[PDB]
Design a protein around this ligand. Sequence first.
Ligand code: THG
Ligand code: THG
Ligand code: UMP
Ligand code: UMP
Lengths: 264, 264
Amino acid sequence: MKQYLELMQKVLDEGTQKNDRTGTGTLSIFGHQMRFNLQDGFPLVTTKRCHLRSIIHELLWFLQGDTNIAYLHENNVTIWDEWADENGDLGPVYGKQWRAWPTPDGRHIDQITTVLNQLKNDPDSRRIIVSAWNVGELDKMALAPCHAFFQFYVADGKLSCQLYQRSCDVFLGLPFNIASYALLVHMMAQQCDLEVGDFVWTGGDTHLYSNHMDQTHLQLSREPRPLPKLIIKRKPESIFDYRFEDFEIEGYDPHPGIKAPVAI
Amino acid sequence: MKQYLELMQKVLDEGTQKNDRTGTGTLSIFGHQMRFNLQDGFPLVTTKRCHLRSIIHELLWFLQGDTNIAYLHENNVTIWDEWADENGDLGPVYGKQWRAWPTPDGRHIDQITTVLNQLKNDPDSRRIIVSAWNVGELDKMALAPCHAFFQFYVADGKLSCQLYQRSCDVFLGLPFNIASYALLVHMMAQQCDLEVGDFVWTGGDTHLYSNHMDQTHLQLSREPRPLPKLIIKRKPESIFDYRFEDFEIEGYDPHPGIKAPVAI
Ligand SMILES: Nc1nc2c(c(=O)[nH]1)N[C@@H](CNc1ccc(C(=O)N[C@@H](CCC(=O)O)C(=O)O)cc1)CN2
Ligand SMILES: Nc1nc2c(c(=O)[nH]1)N[C@@H](CNc1ccc(C(=O)N[C@@H](CCC(=O)O)C(=O)O)cc1)CN2
Ligand SMILES: *c1cc(=O)[nH]c(=O)n1[C@H]1C[C@H](O)[C@@H](COP(=O)(O)O)O1
Ligand SMILES: *c1cc(=O)[nH]c(=O)n1[C@H]1C[C@H](O)[C@@H](COP(=O)(O)O)O1
């Protein structure tokens, strides 16, 4: 996508060398923002084939408040293998915080349910937020939340969402992340009888891994193509009742997928 | 400042009318980002005289982990009066979350000390973050955190910081918020023997209150003047030992102040 490719190029031109916790090394910039009007098309990168099967199952997995990769494996999703433990646990990551953020007093808060009720009863609210950045549980997570905090907004009957990604693997993670949240917006909008607005992506430490340079140059040599159209074939009774079969992408004809090693 | 005036103009040009919690009504946009290179000068709005006295005291107050307005009153700062209870309490807002975020197992995390340790031992870390958005205590607070989440970054010996402000009163609050974090960056940089980088401001629901329009246009009719200069006269033993007198702003020649009503 135009904005994705411009970011990729910006990291190459302006990024500075960094030595991350892994020791792989990266080129990094700090602070960037992109906007995707969801009515212009589903923001699924076309300069490389991105498989939605993994994106969709991970999101449904998050919404169920599950943090054990069992469900993912049952659908052959391996994106979370490199961080799960012997029992397939990741600790109180995304799913847990989204559906059951533990309060100091031993109880839990369901942020997704809160958000749905806010969108339906108080759409003008400036507090429609979901945060996975539970400071008190970071030490228990297999890894700290990358897509850390997001906010919804309603105007002119349209639902928008802004994501703050504190750390972003531009080549491997970003395409996945953008599609995941764009999808969530479509789902929320459907449950709230709203049209889709913009997905605003904001990044903190936005980087390209040193061992992703060849792939980056390859992708930058490719021209983006018209974005596909997301079709939801069934309207479930709640945001928690979606299933893989409900989603279908139309008119998606991307350049060939590009293989690249992930940093552990 | 150029960036600030351009944001005001952006809200005016692309904003949508919206009702709000205070029942005042606003003109708002969703998603914005701007940067202030702190080496260019201290980002204190010059198109209207801004009260640095209250800004400094509010920040020292946050850093002490205080959430009662008594300290502010002792120093003639009234910006938090409208929301404090009869005892002067605001609940576990900014200060409390910054210095003692309560975990579910009875511990408390001092995020400010944590960030300082990360800057010292692992400046390339991609998780040098402070969050005031404690989901479990939001409804104990007089108001939900506006400047809700911020991240630090270090490159070429310069300290940068990005703030995600989920709700922004552009006319009254923003000038304060920008100077506040710029001040914090200078303080942290001094404690860490780093030079200042950029302060990146990102907004969610960024609005102008309906009853701030004439004041906003009056301010927009003015040309920004040279940015003032911030001089820190001492290096305290810790980030928690600064005093009002340690700060001096030089060359601040603002246009006349413009009064406006705060939305409660
Ligand atoms: N460092 C790194 N670590 C991560 C993530 C990341 O973002 N980068 N994100 C989380 C895991 N998510 C992913 C998402 C995509 C991939 C990935 O490897 N994608 C390949 C393979 C896709 C497939 O499996 O079919 C691609 O070509 O798109 C790896 C981890 C947690 N850890
Ligand atoms: N709606 C609104 N409510 C708020 C804030 C905001 O951002 N706007 N921010 C917090 C309170 N902070 C402020 C900051 C400035 C002012 C204010 O009133 N400033 C005047 C007066 C300053 C003074 O006392 O000298 C000015 O001219 O700058 C009001 C609330 C919480 N509630
Ligand atoms: C984290 C997970 C995701 O969904 N998207 C991402 O881009 N990533 C990347 C960012 C970084 O390369 C790595 C996490 O490392 P750290 O926690 O920032 O040290 O995964
Ligand atoms: C909150 C505190 C601050 O330091 N800066 C701000 O801009 N404000 C503003 C945002 C909004 O106008 C109001 C809070 O109201 P709500 O919680 O967003 O409904 O104060």
